[PDB]
Ligand binder design. Structure first.
Ligand code: 2KH
Ligand code: MG
Ligand code: MG
Ligand code: ZN
Ligand code: ZN
Ligand code: ZN
Lengths: 43, 160, 266, 114, 559, 156, 65, 130, 47, 196, 138, 84
RNA sequence: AUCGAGAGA
DNA sequence: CACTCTCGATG
């Protein structure tokens, strides 16, 4: 429930890759495996 | 590069030679350069090979490249398979791609080619050109729900 | 006597630490397996729920009831419901005990195993009584009621085998160790540097002689001495746990012998 | 949902006999006995007790599948010695040892406190 | 593509699969409920009228039974609602739709069905519990573990089609596949680790256990093999009792490194007439290798004997392993103190080297390699240095591991794990990378806000000195997270693009087969190959053989 | 030297010197004519194509050329008599067995080898993890890329 | 939910020791280890069985229905 | 009957990553052209350096292995350490040097000699005493 | 223990997933591809 | 699954007798395979086991927080103080025979969780069921007693096998087999077949 | 009181962050992990705690710094599929389908972040006495 | 048109597809209580009976092998060699 | 059944 | 361009 309540979705150069700026803002581990990988993120 | 060369005494010995690798391709003018052996020159672009040395050399280079892709992973596929693929890509006279632009433009059955990528338009131009479907294709007997001429159905059974 | 020997190192109401001598490994093992799985015990096998306004689910509570240890002293003169010639169950095969709890006080009203009340006729047999090793005399905490919550149910306890369900398990953990010095070399110890220093020394090492480095490996030696500790749950006293374990093993061997006796028929 | 009843571990089914004695076709004077509704508890014990009989050439038990509570016991004895007699002697030996063990444990229990 | 090239079918089942050491290679565990559900139409003949009558008498809900009875008129009798389900006079010519029973041919399948070995005919074995049970050695061609994997089962509905399954799609007939002219099945996991453990020279087995293992082989002749040791105690070696599983007439020879017939390291492999002479049995032998044991047994004794061989090997090895035990803990990831010191000082001298190269490049003394930037030369040098560091430390850790080390044991057996696993767990996980380069500057001139700008040091660009045993620092954790992320991304991308490539290949080479003149043609009759594979041979019956005339001196050739 | 070919001759020979139990200290009852003409006549039975015209026969001798090189290499007089030390019976058994296995090794007509090839390439392409290699390169090849990512010229 | 009646692993009764455990924690002000020791929970499976338990029923009883 | 008989002087003992089996290297105290290599279960019959082991190759003392009953049976050994294996290679170093390779359940053996009646037979008992 | 942060539509609990977008009013310069006639582009999304 | 991406389904269930056991009589609730360790490199699983063991014995709460100075060596020392092998190994005995196991087993408490995927919610089997209306093919779904898609790739497999009759059977009898009438002239489905 | 500050990535670009408060201070344990000494001086901010880089699901993972990152991802995915008490009032809610663990247990190995995620109060799993062993091969 | 019994160029050996097809057809016939041309000797399974009927060459069927040009060669089951 | 969403390998 | 269960709103 907590995980779902803090979720990020992204429509549509490398939006999937874990960017450096994601540090401390978005969890590096938690992301769905497959098609929505890197696009769906968690705070 | 290290290279295996027949020794004058008989056996094979490692005879190392200097080989020039290259970022960039222009086979049409590099092989005609005085100083190198123009009979062993090679490029990973089987396009240029096919354009300069012929369709057979293009076939050999194509196989060499596919096999290189397979073996680079450490895997191993028997020769006849990749050979079959390359042969099918190369029998039309040139380099036929494995896409909706390549083999799907062949003069085969309408239903077969319609069972892949461009479906409806194939049937459209088939109806517009009044094409005859031999129904000896696999997917065509698959559609008709009949025993296709495949392995077990590659013949007939009668009584004597 | 003349055969396998026993030496009770420690003995209590709950635990028996003893030493089996002059026994084969298979017999000790099988005795353990029987003591764990194949000793008859009385436990709740049926639960009829009339009213249940408690938080817990019906079959939840029923499960907890099933796990309750009941007196299984005279269990050998009780019968299996499957063997009894009665309908469903009776007094010769099962023990019926009720449970009526209701939230009375403003505070939480606890429901213990002591609140179970025998209804059926025990007719002399020491059986059915829920074990209470609790200090305050309550026993297993079955449930908790609020203020207006009620639990009304009836329990039919039947004779059962722990092989069928673990709730009929008369024993807890059976400690089992032979050859504390690994003189038989049944175990190749994992180590980083010094094997002996890393692995803790067993208590049973006090009861055998350490190997001499001048002596080679004894390849002809078997496993004779076994250090065991049998723990009971209360349904059956420890001594009777191991004794009825032996009796059961012997009995089911005798059943095979009897089968052989019967296979001679034309 | 597809789980078998638990009593099928020890309760003999319809028509299922306890012991199924079959002539072994491999080696001469050998036998394979199918024990139903039994496991390692009886198998390992009987097998181990059959290796004590010096007139027994072969003795081995196996549980072909842990789903079903049954095991096969193969016994090969010397000529002039029926394997069923070896099984019987093994069983009786077991029973005697267990009787002695029980008696000893009982006499040892009476000499204890607490 | 959705209703013609493929469509949902009747007489199909699907369930979570699980492994079973006591099922044959070509068997499939089928849950009782599924067996009750799926049915087969069997025509009433004098051969089976009694059996079918009994099956009908059992009806549905009880296995083995029947669901429906079809008469001459074509009317369908429902055996669960019919008032005459009790008394039925089965006439000849009638059909009885009976439950799926043992040894019925069924098509086992796992998606994605990438190659023909993804669909193979198995023999039904009705079992309790609700899982499709399969043999471990059939895992590889299906590519399936048991962590929630589900498989499908299709039941043939006539004699000719189940004949097709039993004679063409049978699992033993698929052991040696024409994909790589080698067997696609072998001994794996517990059986592999265990068979490596068993065939050690230190491994001896005394009488009782020997008798049990001997009896565990169904193809045992009942003859007790004379023990390798007579006095002062009858002991059998692992190789000796394992040899019983291997059929007679099976000769296998393979030299490894220093294998000299006496083989001081017990490596290589020599097996004479189904009796292993010497060599530790592991993946090179009992695996799915080219000229391995499975390939030889298949080509010599036949597919049936090879499947049965899988069975026997599995039974014996699993038995021994069960009563021997095998584990793995954190202790198997711990190298000695001095080893860790050498690892740390190795990473130290590596970082020092990188520091020197950095200082050199900053002094504008770094001469760029021909054809690339000074900066690219620097990057290449640093990356190579850090890689050499990881490999060095990892090799130190690997050397330090004993033969009793469980991880190293699984590595030796070829059952699981490799060098890089030991390296990254015990020594140093190494340099992380994204898009072929080390961690780029996401922020201006720096990778993280914890570093200063223009920091090209190893720890700044994503080098992880620490191992998984030691624990990763926050920076290392995030950089490794970036790398791993790229991994998952290009993994999904890979399975997608491959998924497309395979379909394209199939649809392109679809209508091609060998005709009765050994000519490889298509539906148009166009010659692709005049002789199939240029030699007219089936890939399955092809083995790598040496042409010992192409090599050697002319003197040796003459001699 | 190591190349995939039908009929494992080594296993056949080592099965010959196992079935007939020939000792390495006994004169073979063979003859030069037996071995030479025997092997030379064995090659005439290794049939893949079975026409009666010149073309098909040429294709036949072309298709079995390699395997016949292997055959001549393994079944040379010196090798058979000295290394193998086969007898007449054992030699004939070897020839018969080789012919049999060769005939077994022939591809069966009706073999859907197009799909077989496509799967034999596609399936290992699934377990795939400085020029461009791997899956993207395979995609370039199959698409016949007009502009490949890494055009390289190897000059000797 | 509520304290498990018996230990999963071995089978030792532990459902009668929860209140005693709580008392040993609050009344005698002991630590969890000693409290678990005095209750005769030597094996770490039972030790776990009580230590690891969360008494959720005490919150469940906060509702009136 | 008996096939070979000699007294060897153990010159080396090598526990090559083992803990129950060592590779022993010895030589004949009779023939100056005879040597021996042998895998020995040290846990059963310990072999220290510089030992004079009496070694014998026999062909007898097929049928299944009966347990040693009673006996009351001709053991035909009274040695200290007896094994049973299979010859698999007859290496010819020279005309005056012929070597044989025995395999005792994986415990290999290389015996180099000159003058032998050791045929490639399953019958291969290795008897060592003192 | 319920933390809220969701809605209840037709008795069904609903969560609004945070939608990621590009920041407006930000000046960004990007290099164009090689076949492109234009080499660099300075764009801004006005809000 | 464990708390480290180590997923797996139950292969079988053993009663306490058949289960291996330590000298204390402790039996595992769960048995996992060591082959699921070295390739995946889930060291944190093992460390969690060690820490949980020590915490169980000492009655304390194991701090398995990410970036702390808690090391396997300290946990090992603590475990050794409690009288066990510092690396979590314990000498176990085979349940079937009672004989010791040669190798010692990594044995201890580990937090496992039960996932939503259970067999009886997955298990599906259909033999002639409800069809669709448009295509007259088996419906989609386990709850609707539907069939399973014999897809394109499966078809490709059966082609590779050469099994033609099976392919036809899957695509006719086992699915939507229909009989139509065709005109001998134009060859269309214009035929009005007044049967009987 | 100007003790804590809110920083987004854009402003994060212009600051220097200390990883631990012990990076402001001016013979070792071979067991502990190797940590690079602070070569930077001009700090303007310090991380509250590095473990706060994780989300709710990954904060349940014990020792995630001793794991391979894809395993942390996988665990993060599977944590949402574990059963247990999702809410205390589950008995007075009419959800489409719910699963409650019979005897939920607070993990023996926890995280400092679990305290704020209410995991020890509402756990999703049990401490199972696990044994890593090749037993019957099942 | 046709192809004469002499000058037949196809394989004298029965293909595995021909074998499977023949065994399948014969089993299909036996499954509908058709006459058996071999001694059952205890066998009841139609496929097995078809196999035994194949080993004795008692299967009155004939394979029509189709060449790509349209030509066809007829090979009786009795004539074809079964080496598989 | 038709369109979106979560997730299983 | 690349098999499932499921949920939940819509005609
Ligand atoms: O070389 C090998 C050896 C083994 N494996 C097998 O794949 C696993 C790692 O490789 P993988 O990336 O395929 N992992 P996967 O099996 O897809 O999922 P998971 O179970 O979560 O790891 C290993 O655990 C093997 O089962 C390979 O894929 N390739
Ligand atoms: Mg896997
Ligand atoms: Mg899987
Ligand atoms: Zn009664
Ligand atoms: Zn316990
Ligand atoms: Zn018309």
């Amino acid at each position: 429930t907590l995980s779902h309540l803090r979720r990020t979705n992204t429509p549509i150069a490398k939006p999937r890759q874990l960017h450096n700026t994601h540090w401390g803002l978005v969890c590096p581990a938690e992301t769905p495996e497959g098609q929505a990988c890197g696009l769906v993120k968690n705070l | 590069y290290d290279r295996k060369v027949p020794s004058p005494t008989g056996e094979y010995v490692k005879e190392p030679e200097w080989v020039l690798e290259t970022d960039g391709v222009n086979l049409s003018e590099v092989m005609t350069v005085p100083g190198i052996d123009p009979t062993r020159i090679y490029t990973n672009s089987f396009i240029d090979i096919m354009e300069v040395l012929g369709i057979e050399a293009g076939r050999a280079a194509l196989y060499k490249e596919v096999y290189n892709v397979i073996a680079s992973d450490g895997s191993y596929v028997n020769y006849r398979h990749m050979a079959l693929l390359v042969d099918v890509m190369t029998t039309q006279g040139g380099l036929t791609s494995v896409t909706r632009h390549g083999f799907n433009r062949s003069n085969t059955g309408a239903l077969m080619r319609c069972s892949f990528e461009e479906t409806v338009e194939i049937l459209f131009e088939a109806g517009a050109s009044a094409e005859l479907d031999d129904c000896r294709g696999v997917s065509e007997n698959v559609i008709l729900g009949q025993m296709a001429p495949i392995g077990t159905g590659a013949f007939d059974v009668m009584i004597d | 006597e003349e055969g396998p020997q026993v030496k009770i190192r420690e003995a209590s109401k709950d635990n028996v630490d003893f030493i089996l001598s002059n026994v084969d490994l298979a017999m000790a093992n099988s005795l353990r397996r029987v003591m764990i799985a194949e000793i008859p015990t009385l436990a709740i096998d049926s639960v009829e729920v009339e009213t249940n306004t408690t938080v817990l689910a019906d079959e939840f509570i029923a499960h907890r009831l099933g796990l309750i240890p009941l007196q299984s002293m005279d269990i050998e003169q009780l019968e299996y419901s499957r063997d009894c010639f009665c309908e469903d169950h009776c007094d010769k095969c099962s023990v019926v005990l009720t449970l009526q709890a209701f939230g009375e006080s403003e505070s939480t009203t606890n429901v213990y195993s002591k609140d179970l009340v025998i209804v059926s006729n025990l007719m002399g047999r020491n059986i059915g009584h829920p074990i209470i090793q609790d200090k305050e005399g309550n026993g297993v905490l079955i449930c908790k009621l609020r203020k207006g919550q009620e639990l009304k149910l009836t329990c039919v306890a039947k004779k059962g085998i722990a092989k069928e369900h673990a709730k009929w398990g008369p024993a807890a953990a059976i400690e089992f160790e032979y050859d504390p010095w690994n003189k038989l070399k049944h175990t190749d110890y994992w180590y980083e540097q010094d094997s002996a220093k890393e692995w803790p020394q067993s208590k049973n090492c006090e009861y055998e002689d350490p190997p001499n480095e001048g002596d080679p490996f004894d390849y002809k030696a078997q496993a004779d001495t076994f250090y065991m500790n049998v723990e009971s749950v209360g349904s059956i006293p420890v001594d009777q746990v191991v004794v009825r374990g032996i009796d059961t093993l012997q009995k089911k061997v005798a059943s095979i012998l009897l089968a052989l006796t019967q296979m001679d028929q034309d | 949902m597809n789980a078998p009843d638990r009593f099928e571990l020890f309760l003999l089914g319809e028509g299922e006999s306890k012991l199924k004695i079959d002539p072994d076709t491999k080696a001469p004077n050998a036998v394979v006995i199918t024990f139903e509704k039994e496991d390692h508890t009886l198998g390992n014990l009987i097998r181990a007790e059959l290796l004590n009989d010096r007139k027994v050439l072969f003795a081995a038990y196996k549980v072909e599948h842990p789903f079903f509570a049954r095991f096969k016991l193969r016994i090969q004895t010397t000529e002039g010695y029926d394997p069923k007699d070896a099984l019987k002697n093994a069983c009786n030996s077991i029973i005697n040892k267990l009787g002695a063990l029980k008696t000893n444990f009982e006499t040892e229990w009476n000499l204890q406190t607490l | 593509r959705g209703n013609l090239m493929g469509k949902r079918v009747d007489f199909s089942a699907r369930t979570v699969i699980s492994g079973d050491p006591n099922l044959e290679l070509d068997q499939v565990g089928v849950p009782k409920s599924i067996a009750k559900t799926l049915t087969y139409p069997e025509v009433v003949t004098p051969y089976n009228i009694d059996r079918l009558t009994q099956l009908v008498r059992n009806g549905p809900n009880e296995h083995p039974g029947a669901k429906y009875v079809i008469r001459d008129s074509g009317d369908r009798i429902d055996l669960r609602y019919s008032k005459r389900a009790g008394d039925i006079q089965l006439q000849y010519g009638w059909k009885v739709e009976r439950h799926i029973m043992d040894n019925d041919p069924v098509l086992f399948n796992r998606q994605p069905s990438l190659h023909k070995m993804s669909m193979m005919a198995h023999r039904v074995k009705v079992i309790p519990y609700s899982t499709f049970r399969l043999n471990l050695s059939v895992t590889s061609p299906y590519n399936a573990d048991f962590d929630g994997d589900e498989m499908n089962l299709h039941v043939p509905q006539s004699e000719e089609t189940r004949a097709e399954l039993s004679q063409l799609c049978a699992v033993p007939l698929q052991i040696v596949s024409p994909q790589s002219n080698k067997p696609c099945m072998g001994i794996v996991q517990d059986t592999l680790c265990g068979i490596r453990k068993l065939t050690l020279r230190d491994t001896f087995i005394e009488l009782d256990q020997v008798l049990n293992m001997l009896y565990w082989v169904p193809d045992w002749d009942g003859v007790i093999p004379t023990p390798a040791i007579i006095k002062p105690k009858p002991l059998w070696s692992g190789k000796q009792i394992l040899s019983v599983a291997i059929p007679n007439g099976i000769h296998l020879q393979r030299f490894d490194e220093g294998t000299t017939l006496l083989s001081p390291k017990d490596n290589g492999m020599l097996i004479i007439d189904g009796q292993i002479i010497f060599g530790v049995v592991e993946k090179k032998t009992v695996g799915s290798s080219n000229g391995g044991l499975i390939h030889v047994v298949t080509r010599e004794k036949g597919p049936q004997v090879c499947a049965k061989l899988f069975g026997n090997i599995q039974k014996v090895v699993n038995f021994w392993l069960l009563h021997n035990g095998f584990s793995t803990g954190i202790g198997d990831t711990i190298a000695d103190g001095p080893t860790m010191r050498e690892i740390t000082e190795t990473i130290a001298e590596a970082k020092k080297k990188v520091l020197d190269v950095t200082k050199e490049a900053q002094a504008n003394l770094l001469t760029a390699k021909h054809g690339m930037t000074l900066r690219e030369s620097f990057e290449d040098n640093v990356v190579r240095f850090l890689n050499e560091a990881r490999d060095k430390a990892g090799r130190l850790a690997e050397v330090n591991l004993k033969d009793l080390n469980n991880v190293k044991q699984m590595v030796m057996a070829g059952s699981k794990g490799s060098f890089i696993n030991i390296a990254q767990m015990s020594a140093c996980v190494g340099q992380q990378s994204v898009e072929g380069k080390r961690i780029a500057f996401g922020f201006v001139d720096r990778t993280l806000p914890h570093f200063s700008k223009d920091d090209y040091s190893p720890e700044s660009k994503g080098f992880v000195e620490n191992s998984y045993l030691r624990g990763l620092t926050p920076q290392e954790f995030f950089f490794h997270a970036m790398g791993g992320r790229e991994g998952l991304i290009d993994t999904a991308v890979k399975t997608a693009e491959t998924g497309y490539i395979q379909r394209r290949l199939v649809k392109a080479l679809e209508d091609i087969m060998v005709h009765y003149d050994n000519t490889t043609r298509n539906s148009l009759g166009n010659v692709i190959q005049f002789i199939y594979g240029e030699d007219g041979m089936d890939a399955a019956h092809i083995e790598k053989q040496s042409l010992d005339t192409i090599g050697g001196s002319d003197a040796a050739f003459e001699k | 030297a190591n190349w995939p070919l039908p009929v494992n001759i080594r296993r056949i020979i080592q099965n010959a010197q196992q079935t007939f139990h020939i000792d390495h200290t006994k004169p073979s009852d063979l003859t030069i004519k037996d071995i030479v003409l025997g092997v030379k006549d064995l090659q005439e039975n290794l049939l893949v194509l079975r026409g009666k015209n010149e073309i098909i026969q040429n294709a036949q001798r072309d298709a079995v050329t390699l395997f016949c090189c292997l055959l001549r290499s393994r079944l040379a007089t010196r090798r058979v008599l000295q290394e193998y030390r086969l007898t007449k019976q054992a030699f004939d058994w070897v020839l018969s067995n080789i012919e049999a296995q060769f005939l077994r090794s022939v591809v069966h007509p009706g073999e859907m080898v197009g799909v077989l090839a496509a799967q034999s390439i596609g399936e290992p392409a699934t377990q795939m993890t400085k020029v461009t290699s791997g899956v993207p390169r395979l995609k370039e090849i199959l698409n016949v890329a007009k502009n490949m990512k890494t055009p390289s010229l190897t000059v000797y | 939910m509520i304290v498990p009646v018996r230990c999963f692993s071995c089978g030792k009764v532990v459902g009668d020791k929860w209140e005693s455990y709580l008392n040993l924690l609050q009344e005698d002000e002991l630590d969890e280890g000693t409290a678990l020791s005095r209750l005769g929970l030597k094996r770490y499976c039972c030790r776990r069985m009580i230590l690891t338990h969360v008494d959720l029923i005490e919150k469940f009883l906060r509702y009136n229905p | 009957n008996t096939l070979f008989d000699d007294i060897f002087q153990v010159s080396e003992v090598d526990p090559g990553r083992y803990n129950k089996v060592c590779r022993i290297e010895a030589a004949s105290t009779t023939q100056d052209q005879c040597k021996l290599t042998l895998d020995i279960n040290v846990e059963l019959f310990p072999v220290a350096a510089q030992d004079s082991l009496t070694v014998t190759i026999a062909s007898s003392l097929t049928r299944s292995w009966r347990p040693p009953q009673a006996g009351d049976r001709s053991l035909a050994d009274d040695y200290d350490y007896v094994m049973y294996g299979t010859a698999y290679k007859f290496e010819e170093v020279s005309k005056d040097l012929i070597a044989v390779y025995y395999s005792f359940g994986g415990l290999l053996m290389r015996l180099e000699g000159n003058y032998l009646n050791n045929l490639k037979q399953e019958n291969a008992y290795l008897l060592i005493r003192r | 223990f319920d933390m809220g942060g969701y809605f209840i539509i037709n008795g069904s609990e609903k969560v609004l997933i945070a939608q990621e977008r590009s920041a407006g009013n930000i000046v960004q310069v990007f290099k164009k591809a090689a076949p492109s006639p234009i080499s660099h582009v300075a764009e801004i999304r006005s809000a | 699954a464990s708390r480290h991406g180590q997923k797996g389904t139950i292969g079988i269930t053993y009663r306490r007798e058949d289960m291996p056991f330590t000298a204390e009589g402790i039996v595992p609730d769960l048995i996992i395979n060591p082959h699921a360790i070295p390739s995946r490199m889930t060291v944190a699983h093992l460390i969690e086991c060690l820490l949980s063991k020590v915490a169980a014995l000492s009655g304390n709460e194991g701090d398995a927080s990410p970036f702390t100075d808690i090391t396997v060596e300290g946990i090992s020392k603590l475990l050794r103080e409690h009288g066990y092998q510092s690396r979590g190994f314990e000498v176990m005995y085979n349940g079937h025979t009672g004989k010791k196991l040669m190798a010692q087993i990594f044995f201890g408490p580990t937090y496992y969780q039960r996932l939503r995927h259970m067999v009886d919610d997955k298990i599906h089997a259909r033999a002639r069921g409800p069809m669709q209306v448009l295509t007259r093919q088996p419906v989609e779904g386990r709850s609707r007693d539907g069939g399973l898609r014999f897809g394109e790739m499966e078809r490709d497999c059966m082609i590779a096998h050469g099994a033609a009759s099976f392919l036809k059977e899957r695509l006719m009898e086992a699915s939507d087999a229909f009989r139509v009438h065709i005109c001998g002239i134009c060859g269309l489905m214009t035929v009005i077949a007044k049967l009987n | 009181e100007g003790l804590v500050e809110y920083i987004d990535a854009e402003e994060e670009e212009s600051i220097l962050i200390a990883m631990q408060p012990e990076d402001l201070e001016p013979d070792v344990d071979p067991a502990k992990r190797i940590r690079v000494s602070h070569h930077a001086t001009t700090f303007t901010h310090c991380e509250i705690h590095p473990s706060m880089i994780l989300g709710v699901a990954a904060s349940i993972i014990p020792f995630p710094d001793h794991n391979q990152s894809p395993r942390n991802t996988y665990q993060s995915a599977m944590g949402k599929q574990a059963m247990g008490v999702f809410l205390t009032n589950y008995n007075v809610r009419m959800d489409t389908m719910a699963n409650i663990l019979y005897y939920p247990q607070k993990p023996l190995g926890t995280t400092r972040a679990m305290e704020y995620l209410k995991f020890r109060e509402l756990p999703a799993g049990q401490n199972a006495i696990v044994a890593i062993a090749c037993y019957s091969g099942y | 048109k046709a192809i004469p019994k002499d000058q037949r160029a196809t394989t004298p050996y029965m293909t595995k597809y021909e074998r499977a097809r023949i065994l399948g057809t014969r089993a299909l016939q036996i499954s509908m209580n058709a006459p058996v041309f071999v001694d059952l000797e205890g066998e009841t399974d139609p496929l097995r009976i078809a196999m035994k009927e194949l080993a004795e060459k008692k299967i009155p069927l004939v394979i029509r092998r189709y060449l790509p040009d349209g030509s066809f060669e007829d090979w009786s089951v009795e004539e074809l060699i079964v080496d598989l």
